[PDB]
């Protein structure tokens, strides 16, 4: 009595889900239904496969979203056997599959003072387009409240542009948007919204972030250009120091083991 | 704290018994400078194929053990020394060096083959396969067996399978090797961690597998990248960016500058982005919520038996074996045979720098592209010093997700 | 959590008993969740001892109890969600699972320990599915229940009483009307019934040798399984015959007869199933408005009765007998609410 | 196995130990219990074991 | 003295025991429960690790 079912436990609804079942060594007859009939049979998802040696002919039977959270309507899996019957018991793991989003974006960090520009996603277990409704989506500001909106938006080719301005003033930093299905599958993104200055000046130490026990020379690479391209002819020193011990400063100076300088002028 | 942090390369997840695994391993320290050859010392424990050797200049080196052990296998290799002898009565003291402190344990083969099976487990040329090799094992040579067997293999794909495809050649009674021929070919359609899964078509009840597995790095269905009228000076307001995919499909114009992205570089954003953004991929085995089971099969006499060579109650042992084999991949599946290991029912007695640049907008848009490839009029934004990009992205249902990852003008 | 349903169906309770169960459920809840597992499950420790794997015969009574007492108060739909998906993955190929013993106690499980019992406690646990659903693992347990159905019935001895009650209320709650009628009435042929009433019994003088002291190593499970028995002829998502209804009350004569001065029974599953057995032969034959039950007799011999029977004049015995050597008293009863008489 | 006395009592039973190391023997006519009034402080009679 | 001590029994099967006692008689055991003492290098003390 040699048969073997491999059965995926993984669900997708209404997606491609292939199944075959092994059979070697001819017996009497093996068509076996890795059934899905109910406690009173009245739903199923009865796709069984005949059973013949030494092949493997796979199919797909792809199934439904059921009720609130997934429900496989009472499973049952009945070994068909012409003398025989050999059955006991085993189930399935059980989720819906929203048709699945995501977004992209200009940018996250934006300037207040001009407006904003986004696209959104939707596809399926398999990675193919998908133009289906969604209940709604509306731009959050981060007070536990929504400042953009378009409800019930619907894709193009599984996709949709839409602007949005933004104040010259609003609250600072990230600003979320979400989109939420009929189930509620909620996808994040958020726009920074901050009025940090261009600041008139840059220096970029490199240093050993891994300074470690025995080593000959290090060569600290500090070279920033205020705006990329202008540095001056002059002189730089930095704090190189050995430091890291929690200091109340009774020295007066800060918890330095030690300060070293090695300040060069700059070409 | 430490010094010389060492690796473990390619060494197996776990072994079998019938076949010498091959152990590798890597070294990078201080400024990333492995010695090109200094000695160590190879630690056979237990199994006692202590095989001393040296890196390659990659770090890199390939060592194997001789095959005669229990499950109970300890391997590791050591580069300096033992313990922490200098200066170290303080208990304000430590100095270390990296542990190569590996293990693993051991098929449960009541059924005695098994498969051993080489990886990918690293950089991939996709759109492409690999005469796929493994070591076949049989097991009195045959007991009684046949002419042939079938090898059809599994390849758990997207929780699941897709492919089909199947092996299998003769028997010879009474002599064994192990070399096999197979290959798969790396597309799409797929979990990006590619569970291989092959077996014995067993008429005694038994089958042999394992997590054995490779990699799908990012690779694509449909195609597209792009092409520009050149880096030009200030008033070069015509240009172009032709951009190329599939016949019918809705794509992108998101001509842009890149600098305030070199502030905060594409972290979530790339194909492997749009692959990993997926929910619930690969719940393997026993996920969250999911468990073992008690199977009602009983190894139960009323005292402690263990017969051979030694008083012991039912020697409580952790290893792997077939129905946990099951787990490693996803699936579930029915099976009247032997594959899961005799554990009994207890008994009556025994229980950041903010670098930003100037905002304004430049291109954003959607066009469809044709049979011959839109090209489109990048229009330039004069008094920007600077290098720049279009992150677009295409789709459609007659190719599927597509995207122009990276291109560059100054 | 039987008990408030029990109080609050009879409709003499209070508020007060009520909120301080509140208190109870709350703190008891969460103390269930001092000794639970970090993935879901549950065991008796839990916490301290990380690894580790849950009970089996304990978990199916903790997705029961955690159905009811959601069904009194609030829950968070995880506990049941993860639970029930537990007994769920606690499925290899084909059989019928056993107990992960660990027990600290043999009695808080009134059962016998073999499968068989156990598996149809998880189909009844799993399908009495009071608001919310019972997805996946149920099913399989009518699977396995009727395997080991096929293989006792194939027999004719399972403790005779005992694993094929099971089955009746198992096949009843899942509606196998023909199946759970073939082992009920196999059960009702097998009959232990008592002078003034119903009840079963395993052989009693038991095949294998017994001890000493309440013959140990066997809780004798009679509350629970009896009312395992009483349980299956209550089940119809209409209603059953009335005949149920009689056998019901014999049995339950036998309860509350079963019953001593404390509280509950020998045990914790027969109290809980017991209280529960009860309540939804009351959650049948009680509704708020519906106390207007009217009675006649009609005997020939211008010799008949009427009453009438309500939720304030609710329970007085009519102690009242007959001149003729015959019975030939026809009944009569119309109204709202169902009655127990008893003749003899 | 079920025996019985012979006129010594004696019975020559045979067990094939085709099992394993750590035994356990036991032999009665009675069980693993003082069958009548065991747990009482006040009963002293007993079943040889 | 005489000893195979591995650092465990390797009953590469079944089970991974590790170093595993016993307590099976010995005929050092049956010449002490007779009493007496004799000299040989051959197996007879259990191979005790
Ligand atoms: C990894 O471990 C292996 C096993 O230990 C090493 O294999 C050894 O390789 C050597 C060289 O091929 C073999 O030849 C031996 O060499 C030693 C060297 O001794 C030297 O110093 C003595 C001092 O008196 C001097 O007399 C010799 O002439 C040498 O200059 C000899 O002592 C041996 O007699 C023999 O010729 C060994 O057979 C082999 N095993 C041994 C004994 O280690 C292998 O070398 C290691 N990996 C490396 C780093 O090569
Ligand atoms: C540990 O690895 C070694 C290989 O380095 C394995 O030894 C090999 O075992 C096979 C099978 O016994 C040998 O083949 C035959 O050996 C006999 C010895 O008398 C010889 O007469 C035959 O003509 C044939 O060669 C093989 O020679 C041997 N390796 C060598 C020296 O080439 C060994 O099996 C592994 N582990 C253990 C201990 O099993
Ligand atoms: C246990 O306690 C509850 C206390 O609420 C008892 O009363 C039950 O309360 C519910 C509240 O919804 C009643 O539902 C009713 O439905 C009608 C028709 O929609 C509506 O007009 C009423 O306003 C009310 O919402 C329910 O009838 C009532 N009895 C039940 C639930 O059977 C209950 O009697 C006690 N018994 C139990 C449930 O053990
Ligand atoms: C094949 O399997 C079936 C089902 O268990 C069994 O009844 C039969 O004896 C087996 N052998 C053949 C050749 O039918
Ligand atoms: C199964 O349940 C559905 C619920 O709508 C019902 O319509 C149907 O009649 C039931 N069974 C059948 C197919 O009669
Ligand atoms: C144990 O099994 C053997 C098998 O040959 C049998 O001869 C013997 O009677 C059995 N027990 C004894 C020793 O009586």
Redesign the interface.
């Given at each position: 009595?040699?048969?073997?079912?491999?059965?995926?436990?993984?669900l997708?609804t209404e997606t491609?889900?292939?199944?075959?079942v092994?059979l070697?060594?001819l017996n009497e007859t093996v068509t076996?239904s890795?059934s899905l009939?109910?406690?009173?049979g009245n739903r199923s998802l009865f796709t069984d496969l005949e059973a013949e040696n030494?092949?493997?002919h796979?199919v797909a039977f792809a199934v439904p979203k059921?009720?609130?959270?997934?429900?496989?309507?009472?499973?049952?899996?009945?070994?068909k056997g012409p003398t025989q019957?050999?059955?006991?018991?085993?189930?399935?793991?059980?989720?819906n599959e929203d048709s699945?989003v995501?977004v992209?974006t200009?940018?996250?960090?934006?300037?207040p003072?001009?407006?904003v520009?986004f696209?959104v996603?939707s596809?399926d277990?398999?990675?193919?387009?998908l133009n289906e409704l969604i209940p709604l989506v509306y731009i959050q500001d981060p007070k536990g409240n929504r400042i953009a909106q378009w409800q019930s938006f619907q894709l193009?080719?599984?996709?949709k542009?839409f602007?949005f301005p933004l104040s010259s003033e609003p609250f600072q930093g990230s600003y979320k948007v979400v989109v939420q299905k009929k189930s509620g599958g909620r996808t994040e993104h958020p726009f920074t919204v901050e009025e940090?200055v261009?600041?008139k000046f840059e220096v970029?130490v490199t240093v050993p972030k891994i300074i470690?026990?025995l080593?000959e020379e290090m060569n600290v690479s500090v070279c920033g250009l205020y705006t990329?391209?202008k540095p001056v002819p002059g002189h730089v020193t930095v704090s190189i120091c050995r430091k890291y011990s929690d200091a109340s400063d009774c020295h007066g100076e800060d918890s330095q083991a030690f300060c070293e300088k090695f300040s060069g002028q700059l070409n | 704290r430490t010094?010389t942090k060492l690796s473990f390369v390619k060494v197996d997840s776990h072994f079998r018994q019938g076949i010498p695994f091959f152990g590798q391993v890597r070294l990078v320290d201080?400024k990333g400078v492995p010695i090109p050859n200094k000695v160590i010392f190879i630690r056979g424990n237990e199994a006692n194929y202590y095989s001393n050797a040296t890196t390659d200049e990659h770090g890199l080196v390939q060592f194997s053990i001789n095959t005669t052990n229990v499950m109970g296998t300890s391997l590791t290799v050591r580069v300096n020394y033992k313990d922490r002898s200098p200066c170290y009565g303080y208990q304000w003291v430590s100095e270390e060096h990296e542990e190569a402190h590996h293990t693993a344990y051991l098929v449960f083969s009541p059924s005695k083959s098994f498969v051993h099976l080489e990886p990918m487990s690293h950089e991939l040329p996709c759109g492409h396969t690999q005469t796929v090799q493994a070591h076949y094992i049989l097991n009195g040579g045959t007991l009684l067996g046949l002419k042939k067997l079938?090898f059809?293999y599994?390849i758990?794909a997207?929780?699941?399978?897709?492919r089909?495809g199947?092996h299998?050649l003769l028997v010879k009674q009474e002599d064994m090797k192990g070399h096999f021929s197979i290959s798969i070919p790396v597309k799409?359609?797929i979990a990006p961690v590619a569970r291989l899964l092959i077996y014995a078509?067993?008429?005694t009840?038994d089958?042999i597998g394992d997590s054995a597995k490779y990699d799908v790095e990012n690779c694509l269905?449909n195609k597209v990248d792009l092409s520009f009228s050149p880096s030009q000076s200030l008033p070069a307001s015509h240009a172009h960016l032709r951009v190329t995919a599939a016949p019918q499909?809705?794509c992108?114009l998101?001509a842009?500058d890149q600098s305030?992205?070199l502030?905060?570089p594409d972290a979530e954003?790339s194909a492997s982005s749009?692959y990993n953004?997926?929910?619930?991929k690969?719940?393997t085995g026993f996920?969250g919520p999911?468990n073992d089971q008690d199977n009602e099969d009983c190894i139960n006499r009323h005292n402690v038996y263990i017969n051979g060579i030694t008083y012991t109650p039912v020697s409580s042992t952790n290893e792997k074996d077939m129905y946990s084999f099951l787990e490693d991949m996803?699936?579930?599946?029915?099976?009247?045979?032997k594959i899961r290991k005799p554990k009994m029912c207890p008994q009556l007695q025994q229980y950041e720098?903010?670098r930003?640049?100037?905002?304004?907008?430049w291109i954003?848009?959607?066009v469809?592209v044709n049979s011959a490839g839109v090209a489109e009029v990048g229009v330039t934004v004069p008094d920007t010093?600077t290098e720049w990009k279009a992150?677009a992205?295409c789709?459609?249902?007659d190719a599927?997700?597509g995207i122009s990852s990276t291109a560059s003008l100054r | 959590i039987y008990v408030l349903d029990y109080l609050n169906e009879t409709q003499q309770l209070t508020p007060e008993i009520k909120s301080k169960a509140i208190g109870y459920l709350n703190t008891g809840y969460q103390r269930q969740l001092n000794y639970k597992h970090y993935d879901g499950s549950y065991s008796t420790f839990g916490e301290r001892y990380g690894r580790n794997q849950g009970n089996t015969w304990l978990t199916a009574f903790v997705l029961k109890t955690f159905a009811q007492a959601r069904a009194y108060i609030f829950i968070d739909e995880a506990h049941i969600?993860q639970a029930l998906?537990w007994l769920?993955?606690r499925?290899?190929?084909?059989?019928?699972?056993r107990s992960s013993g660990s027990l600290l106690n043999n009695a808080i499980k009134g059962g016998v320990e073999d499968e068989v019992t156990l598996?149809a406690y998880i189909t009844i646990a799993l399908?009495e599915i009071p608001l919310t659903?019972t997805?996946?693992?149920?099913?399989?347990?009518?699977?396995?229940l009727?395997?080991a159905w096929?293989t006792a019935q194939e027999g004719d001895h399972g403790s005779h009483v005992y694993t094929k009650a099971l089955l009746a209320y198992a096949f009843a709650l899942?509606?196998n009307q023909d199946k759970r009628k073939e082992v009920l009435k196999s059960l009702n042929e097998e009959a232990v019934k008592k002078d003034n009433s119903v009840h079963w019994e395993r052989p009693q003088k038991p095949k294998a040798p017994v001890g000493h002291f309440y013959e140990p190593q066997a809780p004798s499970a009679e509350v629970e399984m009896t009312s395992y028995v009483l349980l299956a002829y209550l089940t119809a998502q209409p209603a059953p015959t009335s005949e149920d209804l009689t056998s019901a009350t014999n049995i339950v004569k036998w309860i509350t007869k079963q019953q001593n001065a404390q509280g509950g029974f020998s045990s914790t599953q027969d109290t809980v199933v017991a209280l529960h057995a009860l309540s939804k032969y009351g959650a049948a034959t009680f509704t708020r408005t519906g106390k207007a039950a009217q009675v006649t007799i009609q005997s020939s011999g211008t010799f008949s009765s009427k009453f009438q029977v309500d939720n304030n004049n609710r329970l007085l015995l009519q102690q009242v007998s007959l001149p003729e050597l015959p019975g030939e008293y026809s009944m009569k009863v119309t109204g709202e609410g169902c009655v127990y008489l008893q003749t003899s």
């Amino acid at each position: 009595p040699q048969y073997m079912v491999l059965v995926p436990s993984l669900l997708h609804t209404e997606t491609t889900e292939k199944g075959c079942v092994l059979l070697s060594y001819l017996n009497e007859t093996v068509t076996v239904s890795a059934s899905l009939e109910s406690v009173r049979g009245n739903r199923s998802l009865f796709t069984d496969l005949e059973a013949e040696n030494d092949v493997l002919h796979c199919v797909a039977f792809a199934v439904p979203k059921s009720s609130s959270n997934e429900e496989v309507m009472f499973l049952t899996v009945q070994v068909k056997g012409p003398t025989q019957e050999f059955k006991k018991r085993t189930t399935v793991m059980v989720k819906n599959e929203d048709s699945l989003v995501f977004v992209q974006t200009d940018k996250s960090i934006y300037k207040p003072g001009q407006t904003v520009k986004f696209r959104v996603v939707s596809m399926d277990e398999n990675f193919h387009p998908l133009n289906e409704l969604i209940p709604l989506v509306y731009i959050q500001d981060p007070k536990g409240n929504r400042i953009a909106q378009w409800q019930s938006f619907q894709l193009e080719g599984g996709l949709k542009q839409f602007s949005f301005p933004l104040s010259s003033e609003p609250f600072q930093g990230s600003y979320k948007v979400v989109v939420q299905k009929k189930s509620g599958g909620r996808t994040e993104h958020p726009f920074t919204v901050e009025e940090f200055v261009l600041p008139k000046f840059e220096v970029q130490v490199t240093v050993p972030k891994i300074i470690t026990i025995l080593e000959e020379e290090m060569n600290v690479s500090v070279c920033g250009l205020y705006t990329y391209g202008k540095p001056v002819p002059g002189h730089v020193t930095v704090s190189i120091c050995r430091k890291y011990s929690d200091a109340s400063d009774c020295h007066g100076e800060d918890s330095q083991a030690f300060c070293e300088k090695f300040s060069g002028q700059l070409n | 704290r430490t010094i010389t942090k060492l690796s473990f390369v390619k060494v197996d997840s776990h072994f079998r018994q019938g076949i010498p695994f091959f152990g590798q391993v890597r070294l990078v320290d201080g400024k990333g400078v492995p010695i090109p050859n200094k000695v160590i010392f190879i630690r056979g424990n237990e199994a006692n194929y202590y095989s001393n050797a040296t890196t390659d200049e990659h770090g890199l080196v390939q060592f194997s053990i001789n095959t005669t052990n229990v499950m109970g296998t300890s391997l590791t290799v050591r580069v300096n020394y033992k313990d922490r002898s200098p200066c170290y009565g303080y208990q304000w003291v430590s100095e270390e060096h990296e542990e190569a402190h590996h293990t693993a344990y051991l098929v449960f083969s009541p059924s005695k083959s098994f498969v051993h099976l080489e990886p990918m487990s690293h950089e991939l040329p996709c759109g492409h396969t690999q005469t796929v090799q493994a070591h076949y094992i049989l097991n009195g040579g045959t007991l009684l067996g046949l002419k042939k067997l079938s090898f059809y293999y599994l390849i758990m794909a997207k929780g699941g399978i897709v492919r089909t495809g199947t092996h299998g050649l003769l028997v010879k009674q009474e002599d064994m090797k192990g070399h096999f021929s197979i290959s798969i070919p790396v597309k799409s359609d797929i979990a990006p961690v590619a569970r291989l899964l092959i077996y014995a078509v067993l008429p005694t009840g038994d089958v042999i597998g394992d997590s054995a597995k490779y990699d799908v790095e990012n690779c694509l269905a449909n195609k597209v990248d792009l092409s520009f009228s050149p880096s030009q000076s200030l008033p070069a307001s015509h240009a172009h960016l032709r951009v190329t995919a599939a016949p019918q499909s809705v794509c992108a114009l998101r001509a842009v500058d890149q600098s305030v992205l070199l502030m905060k570089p594409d972290a979530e954003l790339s194909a492997s982005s749009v692959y990993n953004l997926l929910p619930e991929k690969d719940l393997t085995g026993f996920p969250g919520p999911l468990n073992d089971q008690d199977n009602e099969d009983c190894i139960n006499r009323h005292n402690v038996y263990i017969n051979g060579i030694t008083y012991t109650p039912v020697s409580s042992t952790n290893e792997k074996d077939m129905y946990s084999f099951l787990e490693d991949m996803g699936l579930k599946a029915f099976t009247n045979s032997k594959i899961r290991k005799p554990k009994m029912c207890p008994q009556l007695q025994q229980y950041e720098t903010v670098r930003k640049y100037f905002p304004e907008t430049w291109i954003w848009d959607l066009v469809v592209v044709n049979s011959a490839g839109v090209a489109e009029v990048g229009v330039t934004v004069p008094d920007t010093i600077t290098e720049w990009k279009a992150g677009a992205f295409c789709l459609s249902e007659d190719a599927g997700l597509g995207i122009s990852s990276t291109a560059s003008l100054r | 959590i039987y008990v408030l349903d029990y109080l609050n169906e009879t409709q003499q309770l209070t508020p007060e008993i009520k909120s301080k169960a509140i208190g109870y459920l709350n703190t008891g809840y969460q103390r269930q969740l001092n000794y639970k597992h970090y993935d879901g499950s549950y065991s008796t420790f839990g916490e301290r001892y990380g690894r580790n794997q849950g009970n089996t015969w304990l978990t199916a009574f903790v997705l029961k109890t955690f159905a009811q007492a959601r069904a009194y108060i609030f829950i968070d739909e995880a506990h049941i969600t993860q639970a029930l998906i537990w007994l769920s993955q606690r499925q290899k190929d084909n059989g019928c699972f056993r107990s992960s013993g660990s027990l600290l106690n043999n009695a808080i499980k009134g059962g016998v320990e073999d499968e068989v019992t156990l598996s149809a406690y998880i189909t009844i646990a799993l399908l009495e599915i009071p608001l919310t659903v019972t997805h996946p693992v149920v099913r399989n347990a009518l699977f396995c229940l009727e395997s080991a159905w096929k293989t006792a019935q194939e027999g004719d001895h399972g403790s005779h009483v005992y694993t094929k009650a099971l089955l009746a209320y198992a096949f009843a709650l899942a509606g196998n009307q023909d199946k759970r009628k073939e082992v009920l009435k196999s059960l009702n042929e097998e009959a232990v019934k008592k002078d003034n009433s119903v009840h079963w019994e395993r052989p009693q003088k038991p095949k294998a040798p017994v001890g000493h002291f309440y013959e140990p190593q066997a809780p004798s499970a009679e509350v629970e399984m009896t009312s395992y028995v009483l349980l299956a002829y209550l089940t119809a998502q209409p209603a059953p015959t009335s005949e149920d209804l009689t056998s019901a009350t014999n049995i339950v004569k036998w309860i509350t007869k079963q019953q001593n001065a404390q509280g509950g029974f020998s045990s914790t599953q027969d109290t809980v199933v017991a209280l529960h057995a009860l309540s939804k032969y009351g959650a049948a034959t009680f509704t708020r408005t519906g106390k207007a039950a009217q009675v006649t007799i009609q005997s020939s011999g211008t010799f008949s009765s009427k009453f009438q029977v309500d939720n304030n004049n609710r329970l007085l015995l009519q102690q009242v007998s007959l001149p003729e050597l015959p019975g030939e008293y026809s009944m009569k009863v119309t109204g709202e609410g169902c009655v127990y008489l008893q003749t003899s």
